[PDB]
Amino acid sequence: SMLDDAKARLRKYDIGGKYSHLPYNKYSVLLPLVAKEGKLHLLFTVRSEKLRRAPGEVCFPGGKRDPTDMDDAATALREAQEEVGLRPHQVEVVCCLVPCLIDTDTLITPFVGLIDHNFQAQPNPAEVKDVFLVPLAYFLHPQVHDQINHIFEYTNPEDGVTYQIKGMTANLAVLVAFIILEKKPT
Ligand SMILES: *CC(=O)N1CCC[C@H]1c1cccc(CC(=O)Nc2cccc(Cl)c2)c1
């Protein structure tokens, strides 16, 4: 099946907890996969314009580890629950992808999660301005704009709204698209 095939592909790239104890400032992100209309999608958030860091930017759910978290996956799930109302029974964490080093002292660990079909996001408006889906296949043939660094523009066909996806968020989306969609019979 589509979902069993996606999980089997993802597991081959799992690094597990290999980098998880290193003494960094630690953040986790959840890369949330949603199956709709017979295709996989990624779920994105738009950060509230009120936030001090990166207001209005497209990002994955997640945030800073706190002492309550049993592990880095727990960080991602706790923060996703706060931000978009995703409950832990609604997400299956499949793997841990390559961590992202930034600022010399920070390590961001991405987890891919399969999201229940009955989940409906409840954006916390103090943190999240918007939530939207992009088909995973978009990231194989994105609409690229050069600002010199590459920005993706995705237009939702439901309403005509265009979102800019860039940086680490764009890079991780492409990675997941490659892992899941490369080398597949039609
Ligand atoms: C867009 C993005 O990936 N960002 C913006 C800030 C730096 C980077 C980032 C680093 C580490 C963790 C996260 C996850 C995150 O904080 N996500 C998130 C989304 C929407 C609202 C809130 Cl409060 C938080 C992002």
Swiss-Prot record:
Activity control mechanisms: Inhibited by fluoride.
Gene Ontology MF, one: snoRNA binding
Chain ranges of the Nudix hydrolase domain: 24-149
Cofactor(s) named in the record: Mn(2+); Mg(2+)
Main subcellular localisation: other
Record-annotated site: Important for coenzyme A binding: R53
Cellular localization per UniProt: Peroxisome
Name listed for the protein in its UniProt record: Peroxisomal coenzyme A diphosphatase NUDT7
Species: Homo sapiens (Human)
GN (gene name): NUDT7
Residues of the whole record sequence present: 14 to 209 of 238
